[model samples]
Target chain A: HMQTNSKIYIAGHKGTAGTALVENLQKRGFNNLVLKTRQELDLVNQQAVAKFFKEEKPEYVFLTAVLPCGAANVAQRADFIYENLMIQNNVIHNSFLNNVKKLVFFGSGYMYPENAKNPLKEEYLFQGDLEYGAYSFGAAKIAGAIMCESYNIQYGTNFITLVLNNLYGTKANFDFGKSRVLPALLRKFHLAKLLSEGNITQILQDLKMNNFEEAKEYLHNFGISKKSVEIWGTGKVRREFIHSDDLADVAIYTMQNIDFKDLIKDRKSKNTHINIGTGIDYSIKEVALMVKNIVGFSGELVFNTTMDRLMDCSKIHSLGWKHKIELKDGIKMMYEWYKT
Target chain B: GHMQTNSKIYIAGHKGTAGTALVENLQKRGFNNLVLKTRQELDLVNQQAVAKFFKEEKPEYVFLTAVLPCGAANVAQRADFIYENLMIQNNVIHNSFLNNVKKLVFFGSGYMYPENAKNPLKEEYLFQGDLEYGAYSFGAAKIAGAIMCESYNIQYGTNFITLVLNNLYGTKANFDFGKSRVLPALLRKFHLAKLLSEGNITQILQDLKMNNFEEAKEYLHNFGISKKSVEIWGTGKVRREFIHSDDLADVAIYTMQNIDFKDLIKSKNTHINIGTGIDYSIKEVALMVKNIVGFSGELVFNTMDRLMDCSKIHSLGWKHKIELKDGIKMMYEWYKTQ
Candidate 1:
């Protein structure tokens, strides 16, 4: 297959993984890449997708748009279904209409069964049962995969879906209320270290002004103990993680290498997703310990036993992709960046 | 089984073939006052229609056979799958709760099985494997149906369920090719052939032409017509089981009246599939129908390349009380009458 100056359209280019894809593709000298911010292109609207395809006629497509929120924010199942349905329905159908040569779609690991065996494989999907905590997200992902397979079977379009476990990086969400585990933990620790008094924000702002000494003096004056911070859960639950860059690398490689026709000819399930994650997990307890060391804070780690935080991910190890970033190292890098 | 004389029964699709059969069966056993409807008298799709019907009738027992036909003709250019199906079902199922309608029997079909479903699929196979969601709207309404029943059962204690069946062929079916099932489609061919002296095969072929008969006949006459001349839209190798619509009515009515809640509880596959596991290929069916109809014409498969192989409906335990040959004979008589 020749590149032929094919126009590539990447959805959610401003997202953590999306930005990485844009940067990596550019570095590889692919200049025909097209991207739209969410405000410019709300991929959730089906008519918008159809209109865009009719106008742009992009040959290659990548879908990564999503309403990013954790469990607390997504108590309603209907929202996940509605939003994901619109997005998946639009991107997939329009991609086919526009004659896209190939499509790469990403869904989160929550799509797998709840008690998904130690090493979850593609076969374990919809096997015994699914987890209740992420059931909404899981259902959305399952629906997306089903729609992808249905369209592919009906229209011989080449579509590949890849499901990844928790991913964290510079562009990843880190706002405590909004971000996932890794970033949220880092932010908590940073807030702890800056709490000279009730003036934690003032210290961070002073630091942002490049007056490190004044910030330190202010922190001392506020008589705040960074040690008074509290963390939720025992954190002993094991989970998987991947560097955004590694994910980008795998995605790009898979896009360029995987042959769609051959996959179908071999009767391979067109979109049977392979888990992409580090083949290992650190307990939340262990993760928090590492997080504390990186933030240079001697804060007490309080495990809120009442809180729900354990997530299982041993199944992701079954997939060949492994995370390149160790928890502490990634946290240390994030902390240094946060400080600067 | 005793007819439980004086029992109050509400037949949801009292006017449909199967529903009418249930009504007839019950009536034969001295169970009268069977509640049903004529479309003009009661529109099941309209909430007001259903609610008003239920309020006035206030029958104790309910049987929900009211549904859109399995073929495209009955549902042509209509969103019956979403609005009509869901709305009618939601009304009936929910109203069963509101009116305290006892033991509502929701009718489903074995037609939802995916192309690759294991032979003689079990009832537990509802969501065991992926479903071929394109050919039929079965997959679309199923989740909603099961969920509705499950919710009603869990919350309102409405003893509801789905009885999935294989193909149903019986009387009073709409003969219009655009709006009826396979039984009526073939029956219409036979009816037309009997009316015309020329070969019934040609007559059948002619009936299949919806528009531009000049082109359709050209393809048929020149393309070697035969007993095998069936226009299968896609790969016609996919097999489907058939059952008598009266038999479905029997099972549906029996389950609603006699089947105890304890029996359902003991059954693992919550959903029961009703049909004969026996099936026939389209080629085999075409030949059988041709011989039965006595149509002496060459079989010219006009559109063998595009016949959409519908989802294979698997009937695990149930077998047709009336086999294919017997049903065809009965249908031939009905065609003569029509």
Candidate 2:
């Protein structure tokens, strides 16, 4: 029943979403926010933190710092595993020591099993195996969640974790080569807009035109369209997206309101996890069309049938919280923000 | 806004009581900046997570405070304890070197040492005698923390140690009397008569009693009435010690915060047990409890059964932090609140 101003301590405050939290907190008038740079704090260092808790005890903590990308960080599997584990271990341990009132831990929904049924309920976690693309990350998140539960049982620690679905916003990377859906498509649409506007010089100036000619040539050589853009999949798959601010809101909401007693009761239900996502989704083709329309792009959209596709959201939609903003509204906001 | 900050450090099980305490203390004092995480943030159980965190953070300090809570106090817990010990300390100690963390602090518990090894047990007495009862789970964990420190110190010049504490009773202690810690359970029984009454009723009203409320009623209100007969599982000559969680916390904070890393590591994770070394036999305990509660019922012996492992603990080195009478009295005070 309390407001969200419980000495909120958001980790990764410098990153895009992290910074968004900083801004949101400020706007919301929560002045007790705390943050640290990677150089200032590393969650895996035990001895240093062991010594830190003799004093500056925070009443609440928010764990939002991620290695880089979700499963994509798996390039260094061992490092990814170690860093994530220590990060979780240190924060949880410190929260208890500092007697922090509550904690909200952010997890990835990509870890859900590949073949899991739709409308992913909190109970669906760890039911079946996870998708191959995110196994390592899934295992790490699983260990972290279990640790929180065990600590609660053994010590009555108050901690909450949300396995959020794909998040997007101003913070999202628009680099298609190394970004997620929202960011990748944002970049793609930007390029398509430039190409459609016949502004070759403008696209080249931003380095967006590097693979354009080559990609077009390759497609043309393959009997595809010269006035077309390549997409990841057949554009039939669907995905759920929420504004980072929306995620921040849900995250903060869950963090501030989750009852410690309820968590303890819920612990008896193994693999209990709440997904943070807007229940709505759009087809990849729909997403592309919207992006093109917003970016003023007019061209033949090509589908990369060889690429991977997004999972169904029948489970996520029903169980996860409702979406505050429509898909078009969110993408519109991103499109505007990307100009900066 | 405390000073004395800026040291690279690591704290395992950041959510655990001991681990959390260590983090809070340092943060408040500002003696050092500590590393921490949430489970979603990292997976401490995985080797890769441990290795990466160490390598990336390059913590100059480390505190090994993670362990598995075995099924019971001392029965067949060794296997589970070993797994916990190995996974955590192994990854931590080894990765501490890999990441070049400055010092290592190992957190152990008093139950680790042999239950009947010796009274007022000195640091040297650890592993000196065979463990009593089903302490394999506990002993194995302590041994792992100690040895991991030793190996890291020997192989990589890493500073590490093991600080052992006695039966912990604090804010978040497990309250499951059926399998919970003894002191807390006792405190609970005395503090909330309903708890004891409930347990008594449940046991008596088991299937054997056909859930007959009438049959179970007497045991529930056994208030001020001792069992018509007291049962002594065996010859009943064994004794054990207890300690206050506050004292354990004091020692934990003191040792972990003040002890020199290099000197501590040089000791090779040798743990100093924190406990009140005094002990009492079953007869003595029952008599004392009966007197305190003013139970007028008679005392009887059930010698046909040997419920306990038939062993005695001889405490040494560290004296008991709370005397049996004083400790019981303190528990009673708290019980009043409950």
Candidate 3:
């Protein structure tokens, strides 16, 4: 129930979710936006966020800026938990103090427990052990979610949390150390296809690295050789993927249509956040093949996917929101955006 | 080994259970330089306020046991409970890092352990299962603080640590009927009942800290305090282990002086339980407190059990000094004055 010119703030404009939010809002005619690069403002600094929110007084805030997955090391895990907590807490607290009309916090699928039943429900959060590598990050996400819920209860603010499952689309991080499973496949396959045809200059351009010798050596280390690409594990595992643009759509939809009170209608149980997904998961072999068909790579796909972690989107579906842009379609978009 | 008698120390929450005990222990240890502030003087929830205090004071050691507020066990007030606590923790720990404090210690609660976890809950048992909704608000913040401490330890090489104890009963603990926990609440009920049975309405007024006998009797009615008995909930068979807050302070000081962060955390994990590894049932402890508070009134039941495994800290050459009976006795002595 916001006006067209409502002053809006999308916190992480360069991130995948933030990018989708910007494009979607631009299309939907939200022109009074408060956008800032990291240099313009750092959300981790509590005072800086307070000053920004005080001056901007944004009526709507989309907090999508978060640390990426796959830190894999001790210090990286440290940054994952520490930096994300400060970022989320600072923005959420300031947004409440400034009387934001609505704030939609974007959380990750990692918030769900490991070995939780398939078609994971919103109620499954924090019920058991979190996935090992992502443990610290998941704990931080849970803290942020509870804080948002708390602000709603104490301050009577409209703060909604939407947990996304395996987002892959435009503006996703494609760096080797930071990229998640989907983006790694997209980048590696596209690079491998280029190397197979020996388009040396285009390969240089695509990789942003000069010299075929060094590029090929680097590609070999990542299992992106000319004839074949390496994939980790056996292809038996499966996963659910949601395009970031779709996540952006739902963020706006929930922010516009839902409230904290609405989600708490069930007095029987308290929840961490709502889960959003396609309600379907594909095997690793199926996804790798889909990437091959979309990216037009002829390289032999090797190695795996295991287990399944699909979201049960019934709660959001019952609330009249569903995902658009299915798996192959989203991968094609990733391919197209990767090229551009 | 690293501390000097004159090293600068700041005990952040010097008013609460751990905070008061921490003050006394530091004084007895001859740490003459201390940074202490009341909540009105410096707000821990205000990021800038806390930051400026850290910048100006530049403490070499910090004991961050200060509570922002409690309404914690109530599910209705949980939002206020978790949000402000996170802000309080975020402010102090963040400032501790920026100020380069030598060692910053914050105490954790047994609530951080999952509900229905097995007996003898080890430090590794944390975050392993389900938590009660009633305690989840406090549990989440406590978990976040420890992870934040470990994060700083790993990324920035800061000496930030979190220590957990099973149940704490100290001189400064809550004693009000609705808000207090099992131990202190039990003590107050028994004390008031004994006074009522002794025909001392005047002493009842003094005991309740109210001059109005009419109001005191009405309040005693709400608590089920009677001439012959005081009532409680459940069956009272549950067992729990407790450490005196002062004993916890001793461990915190011991940890600061001897145990290095790198040595304790050979891997990435950081939380360690500070426990006595001793336990008692609710009935036994209640009867013990009943004898200590000098009440012949019948005790009622509300029951639960908690246990902690502290071989890790015991391996570090520390054990809780205050036994349950002694603490319960002295604690009532202090409560009587209040």
Going through the candidates in order, the fraction of native interface contacts each one reproduces equals 0.03, 0.00, 0.60
Give the per-prediction TM-score of chain B.
Answer: 0.75, 0.67, 0.87
* Per-chain TM-score of candidate 1, chain B: 0.75
lDDT of 3 by residue, B1-338 (tens): 76789999999878887888888988998889988999999988788899899999999988888875444455577766676777888888888888989988877777788887887888877766767767777788888888778877877898888888767777666787688877788888888888998888888987778988888888997887888777666576678788887888899999888777787763544678887888987778778887888888787654525787888889888888888888888878888787
Instruction: Give the per-residue lDDT of model 3 (tens digit) for A263-308.
Output: 8786443674788878889887898888888888887987734347
Error of 3 at B304 (Å): 5.0
Residues A1-340, candidate 1: write the lDDT tens digits. 3163668888888887887787777877767988877787777554567788898888887788887547566554434544664577678767877788888888776666666565566656555434554554565676566555555555676677777767777566665456477877776666666663445456566346556556555443422246544544565677666767777876766677654454455455433455566556677778777887887666677765612222233333432334567766777766676666
> For model 1, what is the alpha-carbon lDDT of residue B246?
72
Candidate 2 residue lDDT tens string, A21-41? 777777777777667677876
- The two-chain DockQ for each candidate, comma-separated, is 0.07, 0.03, 0.55
The superposed Cα distance between candidate 3 and the true structure at residue A320, in angstroms, equals: 1.7
Query: What residue pairs clash in candidate 3, if any at all?
Result: A150-B79, A233-A304, A234-A304, A235-A304, A237-A305, A237-A306, B233-B301, B233-B302
Question: How badly does each model clash, as a count of residue pairs?
Answer: 23, 87, 8
Report the Cα lDDT for residue B196, model 3: 90
Residue B222 shift from truth in candidate 3, angstroms: 5.5
Q: Could you say which candidate leads in lDDT?
A: 3
TM-scores for the candidates: 0.58, 0.52, 0.91
lDDT for each candidate structure:
0.61, 0.58, 0.81
Identify the leading candidate in terms of DockQ.
3
